[PDB]
Structure formats: C-alpha cells, structure tokens
Design a protein around this ligand. Structure first.
Ligand SMILES: CC(C)n1ncnc1-c1cn2c(n1)-c1ccc(O[C@@H](C)C(N)=O)cc1OCC2
Lengths: 922, 169
C-alpha cells in the first residue's frame, strides 16, 4: 500500500481521520488537513496553518515537534500515524536538538531520565555545559581557525622537481593551468593564480580540492599534502579552486575513613529471576578486587536449593577492614549452580565507593549478566563492567545490603589528606637488573620505591603492580610518589590505560601524558582509547573529558569518535556510557550533527535495501533481483536519502549522485550492496555496505597496516600500501571503501597471466613502474600479514591495482587463529618481482632488503603494537582476548631477542618460504 | 606415593581415540551453546524493542488523553452558546466528533494490550533460553576439562603434535 490513514488532533479538541501518501511532506499534509478541517466543527477559531507545528511520537518513543515541513512522512516514521497541532512555541532550538540527538544516537534521551541516577544526571549536566561552551567559543574564532577545526590538513609523514597545476575560482567555468614547483607553499600558488588578467588579496583565499572537502593551507610545501603527493606519484594534474574567506563564514554561521577498623562485610539477602536445574543447588561466591588483583580471600554462601527467588539472608564477612579499602575497590559476585555433594550462572560487579567518593550504604539490587564459558575459567569476573544489566524486567538479579558503618556518611579522603601519609649499593644493582628486563622482587621494588622515581621513571607501571592496594598505608605512600612523578612518553602512558591500573590518579596521570599527542597521532590510537572506556568505573572520568575535548577541537576526530561509539549502541553493557558521550558531543557539534543525520538516514535505507535483496535473492535469479533493487532505489525518499552526503568512511569525501545502473550486490554470504557514486564538482567513488557479518576485525587490521605504513614512511620507506577505509556503523553493519581499478588475483588468472595483466594496464615505459609498485607492496603485505599472524591468504582475498600495487582484503582471521602462520612468498609474486625472468638476483635482493627493512622498523616500535593490542582486549574480539594472543606479536616481532638475532631468524624464515614457494606451486 | 585417577584408557591409541571422541563432543556442544547465545542476544534486543514500543503506545495514548481534556474544557462555551440561537446540529457534530475520538483511543489501547501479551510471551522464552544455556554449561565445561586432561596425558607420554592434530581435527 502507498497511502496511510493518519489521525489528526486539532487544538480545539477536534479529531480528523483521512488517508495521505507516505511520500507526502508535512507541508503538503498540513494543506490537505486545512482543506478537510474547513468542513469539521470549530474551524473558525483556528489560526492559519503557519501558526502551528505537527507533533508526533517517534520511533524512539519521544514527542517530536516537526519543524522541517519539507520532510516526508515516511522519513519522519512516527510510531503510529498520529499528528497533533501545537503552538509554534518557546525555545524551539533546545526541543529540536533534543529530538534529533535521540534519533541520531539510536536511544531516546528520556531513557536517561527514567533511570533516576544522580551520576547520569550530573554527567549530562556537566558535560553538556562543557561541550556547549566549546561550541560557542569556536563560533567566535576566525575563518582560518574554523577551517582548521572543520577541515584539518591531510599531510604525508624529498626531491624538488616541477609539475603543472589546474586552478580555478568559485562560480566560474574558466580555469588557469600553469607551472609550479613541488616545494612551493600554497600561499605562493594562490598569489600566482590571483594574477588572472594582469582588487583582491591572496591571503583572503583558500585552496579547496574541487570534488571534495579537502583544503590546502598553512606553512607547508605542496608535496607534503596528500592530494598533491597522490597526483605527483600517479602522474596526474591537481585540480584546485580558490575560495574566498567570506564564503567560509557562510559555512561557519550555524548556531575519618581510616579510623574505621571494623571488618568489611555485606548481607546477601535474596536472588531473583534465576533459571536453573531444580536437581542442583545455588551458591553465590563473592570477592573484593582492585583491577586484576584480589584484596583478600573469596568467601562463599551455603548451598540453597534451586528456585526462581532463592533466599540466603547470610552475613558475608571478608578478610579486610573498611579502612583498608582502596578508592577503586570492587565487590564482585557470581551465582553458581552446583551438585549438593560446576555451572557459573551469572555475575555482577559493584564499586564500594560511589562517583562522589562516598562509601555506599543500604540496599543495592544488582541485575546480573550471564556467564559465558571460556578457556581461563576463573571463579569471578572482576574485569567485567560495573554497569547494571539494563534488562531490568527479565534478567536475574541479586539483592544485597551494605551495613551502616557510621551515623554520618563517610567519604574516601581527599588528595590533601592522602599527601599527609606520603611525606612519611647491593640494592641499586639488584634493582637495575630487575627493571632492565616475583615476590622477593616485589618487596625490593617497594622498599626502593623512591629510587624507581629518581632513576627508573619509565618503570612506574611495574611499581604500581607491586604496591599492596589492600593496605591503605601503602596506597597513600604510592599516590604521594605518583603526584610528583615526572611526565612519561606517550608510549608509557598507553600502558597505564590498561585495566591493571584502575586507580583514577594513575588514569589522570596517563591522560596528562597523552595531552601532548597531535591529532594525527591521536587518530592512530582513537579506536583503542574508545575501548578503554569499557574498563572505566564511573561515567564522569578524565578519558571521556579528554576525548570530548579533542573531538570538539577537531571535526575529523569527532566524526570517527561518533561512529566508533554509535556502532556499539546495540550492546547493553556500553549503551548508557556511550549514549551519554554521543549526546554531549552532539551538543557541542550541532553543525556536524546535521551531516551525521544525513549519513544515518542513508545507512538506514541501505539496511532496508539489503534486507530486500537478501530475501529476493532466494526467490529469483540475480539479473531480476539487481533490477528490482534499482526500482526500490528510484523512489524519491530512497534516492534523496542515498544522494548528496559526506562519506562515513572519510568525511572530506563527497558522495553526490548515485549511479543506480552501476549499483548491485556481491555474490558473498551476506550479499553486500555495491553502491557507486559520481560528482560533477570533481573521482568516481564507490562503497560496499555489508550487513549481517561483523567488520570490527577488518578495521583493526587495516588500522594496524595503516600504522605500519606511517611508521615505514617516517623512515623514508614508502611500500605503496593500500589501507582502504573500513568502518563499523551499527549492529553487524558497516562500510568498506571500494578501491577502483583493482581485481582479485583469482579473476585475473582465470581470464605468466599476472604479468600479462600488468602489461595490458602499463604498456611500454609504464611497466617498470608497475613491477616496482608490486615489489614494494608485496614486501609490505608479506611483513604485515606475518607480524599480525593473518592466515587464510589465497587468490580470492588478495588483490592488485592497475598501478601494480598488491593489497589484501577480508581479514577475518589473525594472530594465528581460525598456531604460527609462517612467512609466505608466492611463486607467482616472485615471478613478477623478477620481471618474468627465471633468475633476477638484482631485483630479488632489493625485494629481500625491503622485507628486512620493514620488519626491522616494526620491531623498534614493537611495544607500541603490544600496548595498543593490550587495550583492544577490552573490545571482546574472539581472536583477541588474552595474553596468548598478545604473546603472538612478541614472538612474531622477536622482542625477546636482539636485533641481530631477530634478523638472522627472519632471514631463515624468509629463505624457507622461498624453498616452500617452489613446492607449493607444483 | 602420589595419585591422580582421571583418564579412563591407558594405551596411546585408545586414549587418542577417546581424545577424538571427547573433542567432537565438545565442538558440537559449543555450537549448541553458540546457537542459544545468538537466540539469547536476539531475544534481549527484541524484548528491548517491544518495551520501548510500549512506551511509544503510552505516550500516544497520553497525547489522546490530553486531547479529551481539551475537548471537554474548550467545548463548554460553544455547546452552551449554540444551544441558545438553536444550532443543536453543531452541538451534535462536536459530540459525534468527540465520540469518534474516544473510539480511536480504544483501538490504540487494544493494540498496546496485544503487544503487552507478546512481551509477556517473549519474556518467558528469554527465561527458557537462559535456563537451557545453564543446563548446557556443566556439560560444556566438563567436556573442555576432559579434552585437556587427555591432551596433557598424551603430551606427557611424548606423543608427537602430528598425531595430536589429527585426533583434534
Ligand atoms: C568481498 C567484500 C564484501 N569484502 N569483504 C571484506 N572485505 C571486502 C573488500 C574490500 N575491498 C573489496 N572487497 C573490493 C571488492 C571488489 C572490488 O572491485 C571490483 C571491480 C571487483 N574486483 O569485483 C574492489 C574492492 O576494493 C578493495 C577493498
């Protein structure tokens, strides 16, 4: 059906019911309404249609005043087709933003109110005010600074030849082509172009890359910019536009405890909604934690018989006093089902102190999460979240009760009182030996805690772990040292973000050492920093504030922050934490919010389009399905939603006009849509929408290959890599960048053969470039896949660009998972490297040198890879969950060996792969 | 003068045959569990959707209740003002229109009630899923522990990785 019956509520109390089209915009619907309201009672008391806004209940259950009346009804998606006329009243700016946020983050804001949580309310209050202030402060600043926020520079991490450039002006057919050096600064290029005929000043302009939102400015040479660097390498001519400063303003203008020596105990009262075998009996094990480490022995219940609502009413006491309890103390429960005389049913963690430092008292009702069985089968789950299960109606829960420790409430002491308990050789050689690479060692490090601060500042992490956090005297003495601890390098600070270091003073110190990051470098670790939020105890924290600061100062960082968080809003354990961060970001980013809305709506339609194609592919063959997809795409609401949007994969890229004929779906398990674009402002961009499968694995791998490329380029080694865009956007939903002019090695071979293909794409002179492009990228991807332990490498998932560049796709498996993946050379690749010859020692030696140099550079940055992978354990990837997965990298980068030893082992592994290359092919 | 009686077989091939059996039993039980966990996760999401759809039903009805409040307050003047100057038709239209509104509320209450019934039913499924998961966990964990005891036994005995692989694969 095309039309829908709609209920209309008029402000006189009158009610109308009539069909309208789903494609009709609300302005059109208000016309039809007024024409019908004529002939219903009390029409003469109404004002004109422009006096009223339609209100509706939307998909997220909130009222929404529908201010944009150009919006189609089918895009509004009211819960039921009910439109109420209200007055165009009050602060419409707050109302409109509140509404749009809810739809944008996939969670209604009223769900934050529904909790009646002081922590949530305080967070929203503090963070929204902070984000708004940044946004207003940004609006004051100049066009150049605003350009830097909105479109920060895309630079490369050095010859001086000359090549021409095409420059035009805004709103003009005619353009100027002329010569310019590679090492010229873009201001000089502007002034040259500005001499049009023979009025205006070149410092009132910027250089836009036409077709995209990339801009050239600042004190850098043309060659350092990625656009020019790309054009110079490929051989193409850059096409730029001269945009005036006023035209950028047009974009911009959018508006006491330590006395308590009583033992710690709790009253375990009742369980609820438990689902177990009635033959068995139920037990609750309880334990106190600080990070990984236990604070005392783990006490247990008596065996009570299995039912839905088991009652214990036990006094669980613990081998630790209240005064000993550290700031980040963590009570951890697990419900077990056992034979009377084992099954972990569920678990729940709880901070003993609240977000305002108060030790908790009274009844808590912890809604538990279900236990999953796994290899390292621990009793309790202290690494798991402290946030309650949001399925409050159905999920199993435990009722407990913290006793009244004192008449007035008690807080954890402030820093000032902590620093009171703070001011209060054989050993030197013994200490060095330990830190230059156990329990006797732990006691020595603790005794020489002041020596570590003076002589081994980078060993702070080691010292935190040896500290006895179950003794409050040790805790205070450690914090004293920490508050005067010298600032550590970015690398060391990344380790301190790990779950092993829960204390907020350590957290605060780690962030303090990460404030020196550049946006480029911060962007390289943004994914890992987003995962570390899952280890946090309280909503308001230094890492969230930090990430919001950087996101508001850089629109690119805010884009990828939004999506990293948006893509896990379906996950209950982080829905609340992530949802509040997105709200805050949105309030300080009302401009970008509009761009991200456009992207979400396209991703919403692509879901519906993909679901249709899945179901139709079973019904009919591909040609007809492809055509039926096109007819669904032709629809006005569809076509407009899919057209004219910034790319989620790269917000400086413009997806303009869909090429419906070129659009299709791919013959893979999840049937991912192949959507092609084109912009006459430009550069024929393509995307793959994949739904049903997870893409977090491929992103992480591509992030790491990209990191390797940056690391290699910093040594003047460009291995011609292709770290294409990959982005999870939702529940088993994401985008992949299409790389043009490439094909899988299988397809090329099916239609000697690999070398013929490169001949047909690089005839004559060009072929020498193509072989070099292949050799370089083959070296990089051979090392990359070896280090990351990426197996399953075959012709269907290895691709080659017409330029000659090799690259890999579809990284489902890594770190050996599905044992050590060997270093792998393919006979077909060695053939192309040797220029078709049987022996080409000259060329093959160079290729060996590239692989060796690549491998060497990654070992020098091995700890970076270790620390980054350590924080990704937070993400819950199946193939990255434990120390064994991290241990893979340690061994693949040979960090336990010297550089001379590792290189000799790499050469052996390299040599054996070459011997195996001949065996595999026969 | 120590002991550990755990492995049922005591010759290498027999233990390896039982490693192959117990590993197959474990892999199949893991898949059984995984299937249920998909159903658990999916049913949690559907139950969440239904629960916010109920909120959306409430908020709609709340909007309709406000309309009735207004109609009752607002109509008072016009019904009395049209009783004099005998326009009893305009009165009859206001009230018939108001009866048309009330009738629509009952449909929305009915549709809310149907969704409450679905959520009641799906909430039971969720508990049934969670129960079945909890009856599987012992088997799965026992089967993991056995698999490892047999591997350790053969490793201690010095069986090569090649033979251990083919029993596992
Ligand atoms: C198979 C897919 C859904 N996938 N899954 C996980 N990763 C990918 C993935 C990643 N890329 C691609 N596919 C890709 C495919 C096809 C393609 O060109 C067309 C002409 C072709 N040869 O048919 C260009 C491509 O660009 C490289 C990046």
């Amino acid at each position: 059906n095309q039309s829908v019956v709609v209920d209309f509520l008029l402000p006189t109390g009158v009610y109308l019911n009539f069909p309208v089209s789903r494609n009709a915009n609300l302005s059109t619907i208000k016309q039809l309404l007024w024409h019908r309201a004529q002939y219903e009672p009390l029409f003469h008391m109404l004002s004109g249609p422009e006096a009223y806004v339609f209100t509706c209940i939307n998909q997220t259950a909130e009222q929404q005043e529908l201010e944009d009346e150009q919006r189609r009804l089918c895009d509004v998606q009211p819960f039921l087709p009910v439109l109420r006329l209200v007055a165009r009243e009050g602060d419409r700016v707050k109302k409109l933003i509140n509404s749009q946020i809810s739809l944008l983050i996939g969670k209604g804001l009223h769900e934050f109110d529904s909790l009646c949580d002081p922590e949530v309310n305080d967070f929203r209050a503090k963070m929204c005010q902070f984000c708004e202030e940044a946004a207003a402060r940004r609006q004051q600043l100049g066009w150049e600074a605003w350009l830097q926020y909105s479109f920060p520079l895309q630079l490369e991490p050095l010859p001086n030849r000359a090549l021409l450039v095409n420059v035009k002006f805004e709103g003009s057919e005619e353009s100027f082509t002329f010569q310019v050096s590679t090492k010229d600064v873009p201001l000089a290029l502007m002034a040259c172009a500005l001499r049009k005929k023979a009025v205006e000043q070149p410092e009132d302009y910027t250089l836009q890359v036409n077709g995209r939102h990339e801009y050239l400015y600042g004190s850098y040479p043309l060659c350092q910019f990625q656009y020019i660097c790309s054009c110079l390498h490929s051989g193409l001519t850059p096409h730029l536009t001269m945009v005036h400063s006023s035209s950028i303003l047009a974009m911009r203008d959018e508006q006491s405890l330590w006395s308590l020596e009583q033992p710690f105990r709790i009253e375990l009262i009742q369980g609820s909604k438990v689902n177990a075998d009635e033959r068995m009996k139920l037990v609750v094990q309880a334990g106190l934690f600080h990070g990984n480490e236990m604070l005392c022995k783990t006490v247990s219940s008596s065996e009570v018989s299995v039912c839905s609502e088991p009652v214990w009413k036990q006094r669980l006491e613990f081998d630790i006093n209240i005064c000993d309890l550290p700031r980040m103390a963590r009570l951890c429960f697990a419900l077990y089902a056992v034979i009377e005389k084992d099954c972990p049913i569920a678990w729940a963690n709880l901070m003993l102190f609240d977000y305002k430092d108060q030790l908790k008292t009274g009844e808590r009702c912890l809604y538990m999460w279900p236990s999953v069985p796994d290899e390292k089968g621990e009793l309790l789950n202290p690494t798991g979240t402290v946030r309650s299960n949001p399925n409050t109606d159905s999920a199993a829960a435990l009722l407990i009760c913290l006793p009244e420790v004192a008449p007035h409430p008690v807080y954890y002491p402030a820093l000032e009182k902590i620093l009171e308990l703070g001011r209060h050789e054989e050993e030197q050689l013994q200490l060095r030996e330990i830190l230059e690479r156990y329990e006797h060692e732990k006691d020595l490090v603790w005794k020489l805690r002041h020596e570590v601060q003076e002589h081994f500042p980078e060993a702070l992490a080691r010292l935190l772990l040896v500290t006895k956090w179950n003794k409050h005297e040790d805790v205070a003495q450690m914090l004293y040292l920490l508050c005067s601890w010298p600032e550590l390098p970015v690398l060391s600070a990344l380790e301190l973000l790990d779950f092993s270091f829960p204390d907020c003073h350590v957290g605060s110190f780690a962030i303090k050492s990460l404030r020196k990051l550049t946006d480029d470098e911060l962007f390289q670790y943004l994914l890992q920093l987003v995962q570390v939020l899952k280890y946090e105890s309280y909503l308001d924290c230094e890492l969230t504030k930090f990430l919001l600061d950087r996101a508001l100062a850089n629109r690119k960082i805010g884009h990828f922050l939004f999506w990293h968080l948006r893509s896990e809003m379906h996950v209950p354990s982080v829905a609340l934490r992530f949802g509040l961060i997105l709200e805050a970001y949105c309030r300080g980013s009302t401009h970008h919010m509009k761009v991200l809305m456009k992207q979400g709506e396209a991703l919403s339609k692509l879901k519906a389009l993909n679901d249709f194609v899945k179901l139709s592919s079973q019904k009919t063959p591909k040609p007809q399905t492809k055509e039926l997809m096109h007819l669904c795409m032709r629809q006005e609401a569809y076509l407009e939603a899919l057209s004219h949007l910034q790319s989620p994969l790269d917000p400086s890229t413009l997806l303009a006009e869909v090429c419906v004929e070129q659009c299709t779906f791919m013959d893979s398990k999840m049937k991912p849509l192949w959507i092609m674009y084109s912009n006459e402002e430009a550069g024929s961009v393509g995307i793959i929408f994949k739904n049903g499968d997870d893409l977090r694995q491929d992103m992480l791998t591509l992030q790491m290959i990209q990191l390797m490329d940056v690391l290699w380029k910093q040594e003047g080694l460009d291995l011609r890599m292709t770290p294409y865009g990959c982005l999870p956007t939702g529940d088993r939903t994401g985008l992949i960048e299409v790389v043009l002019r490439s094909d899988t090695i299988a397809n090329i071979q099916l239609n000697d053969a690999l070398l013929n293909w490169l001949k047909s794409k690089n005839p004559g002179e060009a072929l020498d470039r193509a072989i070099e492009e292949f050799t370089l990228s083959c070296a990089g991807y051979c090392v990359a896949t070896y280090v990351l332990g990426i197996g399953d490498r075959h012709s269907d998932n290895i691709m080659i660009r017409e330029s000659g560049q090799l690259f890999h796709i579809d990284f489902g498996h890594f770190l050996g998972n599905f044992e050590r993946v060997p270093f792998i050379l393919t006979y077909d690749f060695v053939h192309v490297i040797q220029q078709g010859k049987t022996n080409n020692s000259e060329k093959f030696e160079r290729f060996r040198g590239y692989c060796e140099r690549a491998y060497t550079i990654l070992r020098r940055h091995g700890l970076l890879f270790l620390h980054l992978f350590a924080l990704m354990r937070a993400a819950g990837l199946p193939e990255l969950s434990c120390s064994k997965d991290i241990q893979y990298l340690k061994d693949s980068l040979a960090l336990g060996k010297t550089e001379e030893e590792a290189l000799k082992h790499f050469r052996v592994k390299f040599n054996e792969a070459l011997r195996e290359s001949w065996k595999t092919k026969v | 003068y120590q002991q550990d009686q755990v492995v049922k077989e005591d010759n290498i091939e027999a233990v390896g045959k039982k490693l192959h059996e117990y590993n197959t039993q474990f892999q199949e039980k893991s898949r059984e569990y995984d299937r249920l966990y998909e159903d658990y996760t999916r049913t949690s999401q559907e139950i969440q959707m239904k629960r916010t759809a109920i909120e959306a039903f409430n908020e709609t009805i709340k909007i309709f209740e406000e309309q009735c409040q207004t109609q009752e307050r607002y109509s008072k003047e016009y019904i009395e003002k049209f009783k004099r100057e005998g326009n009893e038709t305009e009165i009859q239209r206001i009230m018939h229109n108001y009866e048309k509104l009330k009738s629509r509320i009952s449909e929305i209450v009915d549709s809310r009630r149907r969704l409450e019934e679905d959520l009641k039913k799906q909430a039971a499924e969720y508990r049934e899923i969670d129960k079945r998961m909890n009856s599987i966990k012992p088997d799965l964990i026992q089967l993991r522990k056995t698999r490892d005891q047999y591997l350790m036994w053969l490793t201690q005995k010095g069986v090569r990785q090649k033979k251990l692989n083919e029993w596992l694969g």
